[PDB]
Design a protein around this ligand. Sequence first.
Ligand SMILES: NC[C@H]1CC[C@H](C(=O)O)CC1
Length: 80
Amino acid sequence: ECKTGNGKNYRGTMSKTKNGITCQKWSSTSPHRPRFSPATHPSEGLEENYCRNPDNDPQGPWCYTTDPEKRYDYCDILEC
Ligand SMILES: NC[C@H]1CC[C@H](C(=O)O)CC1
């Protein structure tokens, strides 16, 4: 999928950050207990471990990481 703007409305399936590290799911609490999740941001498309922009950060989609000593990181979504 592609992103346009900040990718507020991005609903692709990228699952690794721009460093290629594997996301964590939005519905897991390991390795990280998330502040953003499907519970809380029901309208945010927080599916699977996919990159999303819940907070509309000018830096584009990110996800929680399966690196325990690294809480999140941004994903590299090509523009739209
Ligand atoms: N600026 C995106 C960023 C927002 C807070 C966050 C957290 O919930 O801990 C990590 C990612």
